[PDB]
Amino acid sequence: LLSSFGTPFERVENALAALREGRGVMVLDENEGDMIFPAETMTVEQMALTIRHGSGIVCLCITEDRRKQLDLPMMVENNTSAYGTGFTVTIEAAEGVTTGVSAADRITTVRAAIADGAKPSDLNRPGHVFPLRAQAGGVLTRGGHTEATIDLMTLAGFKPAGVLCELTNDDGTMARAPECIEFANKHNMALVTIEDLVAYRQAHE
Amino acid sequence: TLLSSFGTPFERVENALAALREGRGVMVLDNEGDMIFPAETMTVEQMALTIRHGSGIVCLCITEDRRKQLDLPMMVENNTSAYGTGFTVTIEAAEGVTTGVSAADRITTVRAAIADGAKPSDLNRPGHVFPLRAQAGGVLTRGGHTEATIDLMTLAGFKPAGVLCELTNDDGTMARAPECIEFANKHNMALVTIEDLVAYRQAHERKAS
Ligand SMILES: [Cs+]
Ligand SMILES: [Cs+]
Ligand SMILES: [Cs+]
Ligand SMILES: [Cs+]
């Protein structure tokens, strides 16, 4: 499917180069493709893009360290979700936003959460940005898009914080693999799969 | 003007109830405009439209009774005078969904939560549908979109549960009134303001006899 885009390891390398250039990455894993960007570089336009063509449940993948720094509890005590998704309580920047919902507000909230020296008070809760706490050990622990996001950010030289959202078709169905490729090509995003990244990590372990 | 486009305040209300019953949506404005549909009749297609044109944070407005029935805690504890945002912990249907994100899945989750006899175990947590618990008293208590939604469903004759989402423009800004009007027209939706509803309910409230 992506072979035309290079071997698995080239795909990973290509994704890291895209991230370093501030572009997004379409990470594939029933296909689910997530658009991901580094939290440090994501722009208002990229956020608008993600709301318009994504599920609109735009998530901020963070480490357990960061979660604890922000004093953010996990959303539920007893996670009964099918995949054990690491949602914490939701967040909104305590300053610089109005309703929290616009692309510029969401990006404001992301930036507040990821800032060096960010404190709990910098964020009100609940809000319209959804932090996901990535499992320690990344994709080698849990082959989820959350873990893929953090691993790609750290491999690319960024802070371990990234933004993801599932690509959705206008008709409400989730974008199929070829549809993800089309979108990636159209928006200058690299394409990689979670399996590619797991393989890359295992080879470099 | 709202008057030119949708009628006087009471007409707007009445037209919104009719739209609801007929299976069309309603735009509720405060500017923040939310597209709303009865949770018991909303279709997959309406859900898709809601996700395509809204924030994608698609919420299910419920009553306190329903929240207690589902055993859904509030997302963040409250111990003040303030009402709060209304968010409970998020949900996914325990059955009949895969990732919970698609329009079809979201609808399945909604239907599971509002079913007669629904039980806590019919829902996993967390999930991709965001319940909002309405303040008892509706808009007369709190003039929010959540309360407006429930009041409209109640007035229209449905179960007190509705789905809402904020209308967003493609560039990521929130739609102002004029864009809301334009969207309602394009999509055959009715349009009403929260103030209209407050007024309407007051006029039929505490009437003698
Ligand atoms: Cs930045
Ligand atoms: Cs959207
Ligand atoms: Cs970097
Ligand atoms: Cs969307």
From Swiss-Prot, chain A:
SUPFAM superfamilies: YrdC/RibB. Keywords: Cell membrane, Lyase, Magnesium, Manganese, Membrane, Metal-binding, Riboflavin biosynthesis, Stress response. Its main location: membrane. Disulfide bonds: none annotated. Changing residue 34 to S: Loss of activity. It is a peripheral membrane protein. It catalyses: D-ribulose 5-phosphate = (2S)-2-hydroxy-3-oxobutyl phosphate + formate + H(+). One of its GO terms (cellular component) is plasma membrane. Its cofactor is Mg(2+); Mn(2+). Mg(2+) 1 binds at residue 30. InterPro entries: DHBP_synth_RibB-like_a/b_dom (IPR017945), DHBP_synthase_RibB (IPR000422). D-ribulose 5-phosphate binds at residues 34, 142-146. Its EC number is 4.1.99.12. Homodimer. This is 3,4-dihydroxy-2-butanone 4-phosphate synthase. The lineage of its organism: Bacteria, Pseudomonadati, Pseudomonadota, Gammaproteobacteria, Enterobacterales. The gene is ribB.
